[PDB]
Every structure is written in C-alpha cells, then in structure tokens.
From a paper:
Human [name] (HNE; EC 3.4.21.37) is a member of the chymotrypsin-like family of serine proteases and is stored in the azurophil granules in the neutrophil cytoplasm. This highly active protease is able to break down mechanically important structures of the body’s own cellular matrix (e.g., proteins such as elastin and collagen), as well as proteins foreign to the body (e.g., outer cell wall proteins of Gram-negative bacteria). Thus, human [name] plays a pivotal role in tissue remodeling processes, as well as in the onset of inflammation and in host defense (innate immune response).
In our complete series of co-crystallization structures we observed an induced-fit binding mode. All bound inhibitors from the dihydropyrimidinone series were characterized by rotational dihedral angles of the northern cyanophenyl moiety of ∼90°–135° with a preference of dihedral angles of ∼110° (mean: 111.6°). Locking the dihedral angle of the northern phenyl substituent into the preferred bioactive conformation was envisaged as a design strategy to improve binding efficiency. This position projected into the solvent and accordingly was not likely to compromise the binding mode; instead, it was well suited to introduce a large rotational barrier at the C4=C1′ axis. Indeed, with a sulfone group, potency could again be advanced by a factor of ten (22→28). The N3=C4=C1′=C2′ dihedral angle of 109.5° was very close to the assumed optimum of 110°. The sulfone moiety pointed outward from the active site while one of its oxygen atoms was hydrogen bonded to a water molecule, gaining further binding energy.
Residue numbers in the entry: 16 to 36, 38 to 66, 68 to 94, 96 to 152, 154 to 170, 172, 181 to 192, 194 to 209, ...
The structure:
C-alpha cells in the first residue's frame, strides 16, 4: 500500500496473509471458517501444497500468538484469463476450520450483481510494498480510496485517490477492498505502476462472482 497508514491491530479480522517459506506473497480474505478468497494471479504458478494461510495477523515481522495457520486443501478457479484481465479470483479451501474470535472473523459479501457507483468510499489494505524507495509494510496498511468508473472496465471495480500518489502495490495482490462493510474487491492490477496518480487501481469484482462463491461456501 503506497500512501496509506497502519491499520489498528486486528481492525480487519477477515484479512489474510498467504505465505511461502515464511514470506508473505499475497493477501486474501476469510469467507467462511474453512475458505479464503484471493486473486487467481496470486496462485497461478505457485506451489499450493506449500502455501501457508495465515489468519489473525497484524505485524508480519513479529511472532504473533493471535495467528492461526492452515494449508490449502484445494483450489477452486473460475476462468481466470490474465491477458484479458478477467476473473482474477480463486477460492482456497483450508485443511481445517478457523476458530472464530476477536482477531479471526469471516467477511461479508455483497449481493450478486451489486454495482457501486462513482464516488463510493471504500478502504483498501495489505502488507505490500510502500512505493519507490520506501520499503515494505511490517504492520498491515490501509488506505481510503474512492470508486471510479472512468478508465475502468465493467469487468472490474476500480478505485482512485485523487490529488496524491497512492494505491495498492506488489504484495497487496489478493487483498480485499471493503465498501460499506462488504468485500467488493480483490486487488488485481495496477496501471502506470503503483500509485501513478493518473490511473485507477483495479480489483476483481466480487459481486459478479457471488453465485460462484455461494456455490462453494453455501
Ligand atoms: C476513510 O475510511 C473510513 C472507513 O470507511 C468505512 O469503513 C470501511 C471499512 C468501509 O466500509 C468504507 O466503505 C466505509 O466508508 C471512514 O470512516 C467512517 O467515517 C464515518 C463518518 O465520516 C463514520 O460514521 C464511520 O463510523 C467510519 N467508519 C469506520 C470503520 O471508521 C472515513 O470517514 C473515511 N475518510 C475519508 C476522508 O474518506
Ligand atoms: C502482481 C501483478 C501481476 C502479476 N502476476 C500482473 C497481473 C495482475 C492481474 C492480472 C489479471 N487479471 C494479470 C496480470 S499479468 C501481468 O497478465 O500476469 N499485473 C499487475 O499489475 N500486478 C500487480 C502489481 C501491483 C499491484 C497489484 C494489485 F493486485 F495489488 F493490484 C498487481
Ligand atoms: C493443517 O495444516 C497445518 C499447517 O501445515 C503446515 O503447513 C503446510 C503448508 C506444510 O508446510 C506442512 O508441512 C506444515 O505441517 C498443520 O500444522 C495442521 O495440523 C493441519 N491441520 C489439519 C490436518 O487439520
């Protein structure tokens, strides 16, 4: 996240860190005790048997007793088409269920088909890069963005921070975009690189996929 701030610890208890060989590589969102969702680009060429799904995290450079760690039992995909920037969404089935508590909670989703208009206020977040020469988050970052339709396909929800250079970056892939308390996005791609100040950021449009998500989580 470029131009963000620290989340208060555990403010977003559905936020997930996907890790390999102890390193964070993408965000995800807890959508049932035993399912997460993320971006398909996050898992395309990954070794999934080795992915660790880390719930209840805040500061990744710390040992944190609030964490719960799962493996991926299987993945569900839905026609990911990267060249056309379509269906950038995967669900990972965990090898058990999370214990729900203060730090680990299942997110809420919009209705199938809900579109958000221009100007809707949302929050992005993640443990990605902080931008050119400013390192990487330890602590989960968050960022106020605004929904925009200009320079955005209908197959995305796009957001923009007007008047300053801010947005999602590498490592924020797969993280939720929360709008009116619901997960309307999954961080998918950037245009003009991170925080161009020119092009909106693009998220996989979760509301286009709720039927598919429900078909898996019930
Ligand atoms: C910046 O964002 C916060 C949080 O946004 C709200 O909560 C997110 C998780 C998501 O649901 C967003 O769509 C929501 O907008 C804003 O805080 C809200 O501010 C209003 C009063 O302005 C208040 O009644 C709410 O309780 C606040 N919600 C929370 C969780 O704090 C904040 O206003 C945004 N700021 C700007 C300048 O855009
Ligand atoms: C991490 C990343 C890529 C990969 N792999 C890549 C990409 C992302 C999504 C999609 C789709 N749909 C396709 C690609 S690509 C370049 O075809 O492989 N393009 C892209 O911009 N990024 C990327 C970089 C910075 C932030 C983000 C995100 F998700 F946070 F928005 C994504
Ligand atoms: C579920 O998986 C947990 C984590 O397994 C560990 O991480 C995976 C990715 C591999 O790296 C593996 O070697 C590790 O064991 C376990 O600690 C946990 O008990 C498992 N839960 C089950 C089977 O219910």
């Amino acid at each position: 996240i470029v131009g963000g701030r620290r989340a208060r610890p555990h403010a977003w208890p559905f936020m997930v860190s996907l890790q390999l060989r102890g390193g964070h590589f993408c965000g995800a969102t807890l959508i049932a005790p035993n399912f997460v969702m993320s971006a398909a680009h996050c898992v395309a060429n990954v070794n999934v048997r080795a992915v660790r799904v880390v719930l209840g995290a805040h500061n990744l450079s710390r040992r944190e007793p609030t964490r719960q760690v799962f493996a991926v039992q299987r993945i569900f995909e839905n026609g990911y088409d990267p060249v056309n920037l379509l269906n950038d969404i995967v669900i990972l089935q965990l090898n058990g269920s999370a214990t729900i508590n203060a730090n680990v909670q299942v997110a809420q989703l919009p209705a199938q088909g809900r579109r958000l208009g221009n100007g809707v206020q949302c929050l992005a977040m993640g443990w990605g890069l902080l931008g050119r020469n400013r390192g990487i988050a330890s602590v989960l970052q968050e960022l106020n963005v605004t929904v925009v339709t200009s320079l955005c396909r209908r197959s995305n929800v796009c957001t923009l921070v007007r008047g300053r250079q801010a947005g999602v970056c590498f490592g924020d892939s797969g993280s939720p975009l929360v709008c009116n308390g619901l997960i309307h996005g999954i961080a998918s791609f950037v245009r003009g690189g991170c925080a161009s100040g020119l092009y909106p950021d693009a998220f996989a449009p979760v509301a286009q996929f709720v039927n598919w998500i429900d078909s898996i989580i019930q």
